[PDB]
Design a protein around this nucleic acid. Structure first.
Lengths: 59, 59, 59, 59, 59, 59
RNA sequence: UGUCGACGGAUAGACACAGCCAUCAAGGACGAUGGUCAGGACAUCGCAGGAAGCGAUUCAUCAGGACGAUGA
């Protein structure tokens, strides 16, 4: 697992299509923005396990 | 962009190969884990911007 | 919208004929003064809707 | 002058073209929103004095 | 208006004569002790309403 | 002494100028509001003991 | 929560305290390093999506060209 230490306003890049930015912080919560193409899905882990429960359709 | 609040210790997922976890905050700093295969390149923008310039990690 | 912050007792201007004054706060209530010629109307938005209810001809 | 009270988040009007809003308080401050056509000016009293010096926000 | 965060068995002082002690917690109820001179009153807010209404000093 | 068992969000009173409010609990910690004039001092019993060391004034 | 800035046209910003804050790190490791501890303040929390998203009232009513009037 690759650990990185960002600060408010800084960004990560993944592959050649996806970019991530930490838009700010509000105490114990962190406001993160994801900029992936609609060709790939983006979801929280609280919901990803509902997707992979056995619903939605393949590409 | 797709924006979400994550509390420290919560997780986010991208595609079917990538997972992200907020490990915690330290002021206006944010410690983040990235969990993708070595099949994908994963760096902050200041790093990314050399790589696709025509190369890989210097040495 | 153009937002202005104003400490109680300070002033604002509109056009070359109108002055606005914050007079004070009392609770969540805010005493505002509006100084304009009778050439223009001044009203709360809930009263302004009456001024839009007709009045296309004088008496 | 025409004086009236408004609670925070409530609305107001001037003429037949201008809307005014009390956006909230912050201590002794008040956030006041103005919504007029660019056909007319709006500034703070300390700013109005620049425009009345013979200009409108120079180059 | 002060706000303190006090754990069970610890104490706080007011004026030069009044001592407060957090005696402990019982779920949502909190056991509290107050030590004041006979120069002053002390009650819960329910009972306080009897005192300052123009009372405690008869005709 | 005066001893009570107060639920979170309820209030207590001292003299005719002082109000106390239990803001709520967090494990053993208890967040408490104290509302008195600057006519009186208030500190936790730790800090009070530095002041009652025979001075009631720094330095 | 208070204060500041802002000729700004934005339901806007910016600063500051009860845990606060900075630096290194092409690193794939839940990475490394430094220095700092209680105030007169009810400060962190919740919902969700392809959006740099969204919500979070210690006083109140009548009203009018008057820095309006009055009170629980």
């Amino acid at each position: 697992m690759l650990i990185l230490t960002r600060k408010v306003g800084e960004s990560i890049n993944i592959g050649d299509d996806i970019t991530i930015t930490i838009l700010g912080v509000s105490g114990q919560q962190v406001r993160i923005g994801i900029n992936a193409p609609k060709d790939v899905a983006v979801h929280r882990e609280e919901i990803y396990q509902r997707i992979q429960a056995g619903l939605t359709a393949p590409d």
